[PDB]
Design a protein around this ligand. Structure first.
Ligand code: GLU
Ligand code: GLU
Lengths: 227, 227
């Protein structure tokens, strides 16, 4: 049977919620033995992703990701890293340890190709500085970048609200105002913590916003993706 | 840093919710790097616990638990198995692979000692047949056993409602009627799936029922227990 390996804890709150999403969008028909097999390494002691760039200690962070990929390579058939910003480590990781990897940036790129309307990239300043989405996506011309001022505002939402476990709906007004400002009805979860907003939106039945949310997509399409 | 290993998937829904509970009851002060390190093996392809007793294939199940304990022994400092009924496998597992194990039955026993009032054991028929709580707990005289008829009713709640992800509050009336019938204001989560009821009770602010719930206790006391 096929096993998903999650390298998480890079948002422990969102890592936990992602595992919930998997079984929410894969309810069994008769028996639990039908349901997805998953291994989660939820290690919040991972050095801050943006912080490791903002200081100089990228090597410390790249070593963290590398060692834990070696582990999961032995245990899982496919692997996801639960942080977009953490994908900046990948060019420094050997190609053999990345064979099983399902990239959140590629997953986002595919969904945006099908959607084919301009969409607002919500992400960390470090994800922005590293230009992961602009350099990674075939659909980069459909990505609307936040201005520097609005980048900082999103960074605040991620760390002050979403990472601390607070009600993701408490930033919905701020996000609608951004979506309006940038003249669009959609966003990309450039930070994984917007998985939490995406879930809270689908719960309340708000379908005015279109969320390109890689973790939602991976959860929904587990059976197709995980081989 | 100390790592909890969860052998779960024996209620994928509740396994996911337990990981959520850990970070809910351990919110960080300044940085995420403060937060609990956890490894979860969420393998629902574990053979049904009660079913493996009800057929003859206990060996198949004991092998599952044994192999996955060997794995987690190498990776974690403390280990929890996310199913009370699955603890029936332990007498057949070598003592060396159980050094790190934190027993849900012992955790329940301790909480009941401090509580010191008669309490209703809600569990699977297989947990009842194996008499895990009655044989395991120093506080066994404080445990009120469900009659055979009410055992089947609880088994139905676990599999038809709680394991399928449905709103745990939808069985609250049925549980209050049991609690009344057996003349008590408390229950033991003899099935881990009653972690889900326990959380839904603490959310709505219902403190008329006292839940002896091992997973809640482990989540709350992570820093003390996990060394
Ligand atoms: N979790 C977000 C931002 C911060 C972090 O990585 O911890 C991400 O997708 O990268
Ligand atoms: N999850 C319950 C009952 C059924 C099962 O083990 O899957 C328990 O504590 O054992």
């Amino acid at each position: 049977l096929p096993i998903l390996g999650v390298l998480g804890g890079m948002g422990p709150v969102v890592t936990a919620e992602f595992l919930k999403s998997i079984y929410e969008y894969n309810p069994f028909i008769d028996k639990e033995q039908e349901s997805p097999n998953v291994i989660v390494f939820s290690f919040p002691s991972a050095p801050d992703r943006t912080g490791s760039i903002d200081s100089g200690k990228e090597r410390e962070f790249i070593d963290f990701i590398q060692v834990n990929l070696e582990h999961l390579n032995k245990l899982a058939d496919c692997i996801v890293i639960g942080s977009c910003t953490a994908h900046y480590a990948l060019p420094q990781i050997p190609e053999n340890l990345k064979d099983k990897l399902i990239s959140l940036i590629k997953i986002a790129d595919q969904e945006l190709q099908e959607y084919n309307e301009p969409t607002l990239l919500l992400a960390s300043t470090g994800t922005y500085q590293k230009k992961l989405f602009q350099e990674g996506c075939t659909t980069a011309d459909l990505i609307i970048s936040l201005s520097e001022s609005d980048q900082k505002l999103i960074h605040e939402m991620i760390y002050k609200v979403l990472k601390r476990g607070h009600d993701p709906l408490s930033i919905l007004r701020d996000i609608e105002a951004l979506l309006e400002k940038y003249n669009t009805r959609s966003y990309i979860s450039g930070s994984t913590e917007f998985h939490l907003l995406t879930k809270s939106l689908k719960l309340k039945g708000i379908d005015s916003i279109k969320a390109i949310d890689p973790l939602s997509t991976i959860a929904q399409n587990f059976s197709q993706l995980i081989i």
